[PDB]
Structures are given as C-alpha cells and as structure tokens.
Design a protein around this ligand. Structure first.
Ligand SMILES: CCCCCCCCCCCC(=O)N[C@@H](Cc1ccc(O)cc1)C(=O)O
Length: 188
C-alpha cells in the first residue's frame, strides 16, 4: 500500500481496536528495548485519556494517545513533576501526549515520525478544541531534534525514565500560539 494507498486516522473506540493499539505499543517497545509498564494501560482506560489510531486500509499500524491533567496527574509526574508544578499553580490546562507507536512491518515505510503526520493533526486539533495550554512530551533523546523543529521547547533535563527503563527529556508546546514556536510556520 504505497502506490494505491489508503491511510485512515481516527479515534479508537472499540475494545478490540484499543487492544490492537496496545499490541503495537508492546511490540514496538520490546523491539527498541523499552520496558512495558501496566501504568500506561491504566491511564488509557481512564476518563481523561483518548487513543487515536492509524489504519492501512483497515489494519491498524500506528497509534497515539493523549492524557488530560486530572486527579490522577500525568505519567510525566514520576520524573518531571516539579517541572510542571509552576504551570499547575497558574491554573494551566496540561496534557501529555503518550504511547506513540508505529509498526514498521505493516506500513511501507520511508525507512520515521513524519509518517504519523495525520495522527499529529488529530492531537493538535484535539488540543485546540479542548483549549489545552501546554502539550507535554517525554521522548527518547533520538527524536529530540525532530520535536524541537515541531516547536516543542525543552522543559526537563535528560533523566532516566524508570517506567520505561530508558533515557528521556521533557518538552512542551504552548498550543494557543503554536505557529510562533515552529520554523515550519514561515512556509504558510
Ligand atoms: C503540534 C502537535 C505535535 C504532536 C506531536 C506529539 C509527539 C508525541 C511523542 C510521544 C513520545 C512517547 O511516546 N513517549 C513514550 C515515553 C518514553 C519512552 C521511551 C523513552 O526512551 C523515553 C520516553 C511514551 O509515552 O510511551
């Protein structure tokens, strides 16, 4: 599916779609040597979470979720709590984008995060509709430079993320003026 492609990005609602989303995350993280923790699944079946999916002609190949700052906090809190405390004091709506995974076997890849562009648009629209102030991410240092181009400013140092047993930096983006934080906005 690359010369007659059909890519569908939508909210995952059916229990079997969410199981399949968890399966992609599980396989992807095991291949990259990340640990799978049951805390992420907990957050996702909670009220303040939303899972998106990416379909190659009806088979799911990619997924991304977003967790809203509620009474259960954010997964970031175990590592980057005090980096968020200032914003929480000012009464800022925060949300963490989480469990982003693509299965490279199910999509004719570039041989790459920019092939999840439609998943990102869905996260961005959600953030502009929910009236979210700061969109937070904790990412593997290898994609650090990519998300910096996307306009995410570094808010946390390079630490060890115990949940994943892998290194992480924290980045955040001010959604209400996202176009002023990204270089790609010069081309529109
Ligand atoms: C303008 C709108 C932009 C939308 C872009 C959203 C970017 C999402 C990145 C999510 C990173 C991720 O999956 N972290 C892992 C946590 C993790 C795993 C391994 C590491 O080495 C470090 C961190 C997760 O949440 O599972």
């Amino acid at each position: 599916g690359s010369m007659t492609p059909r890519k569908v990005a939508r909210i995952l609602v059916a229990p079997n779609e969410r199981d399949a989303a968890r399966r992609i995350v599980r396989t992807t993280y095991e291949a990259q040597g990340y640990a799978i923790d049951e805390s992420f699944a907990t957050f996702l079946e909670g009220p303040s979470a939303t899972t998106f999916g990416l379909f190659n002609g009806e088979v799911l190949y990619g997924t991304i979720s977003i967790i809203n700052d509620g009474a259960q906090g954010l997964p970031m809190d175990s590592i980057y709590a005090v980096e968020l405390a200032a914003w929480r004091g000012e009464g800022k709506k925060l949300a963490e984008v989480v469990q982003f995974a693509m299965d490279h076997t199910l999509y004719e890849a570039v041989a790459s995060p920019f092939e999840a562009a439609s998943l990102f648009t869905m996260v961005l629209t959600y953030a502009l509709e929910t009236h979210i102030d700061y969109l937070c991410i904790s990412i593997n240092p290898k994609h650090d430079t990519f998300y910096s181009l996307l306009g995410f400013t570094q808010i946390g140092a390079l630490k060890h993320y115990g949940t994943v047993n892998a290194p992480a930096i924290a980045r955040a983006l001010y959604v209400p003026e996202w176009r002023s934080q990204t270089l790609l906005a010069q081309f529109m």
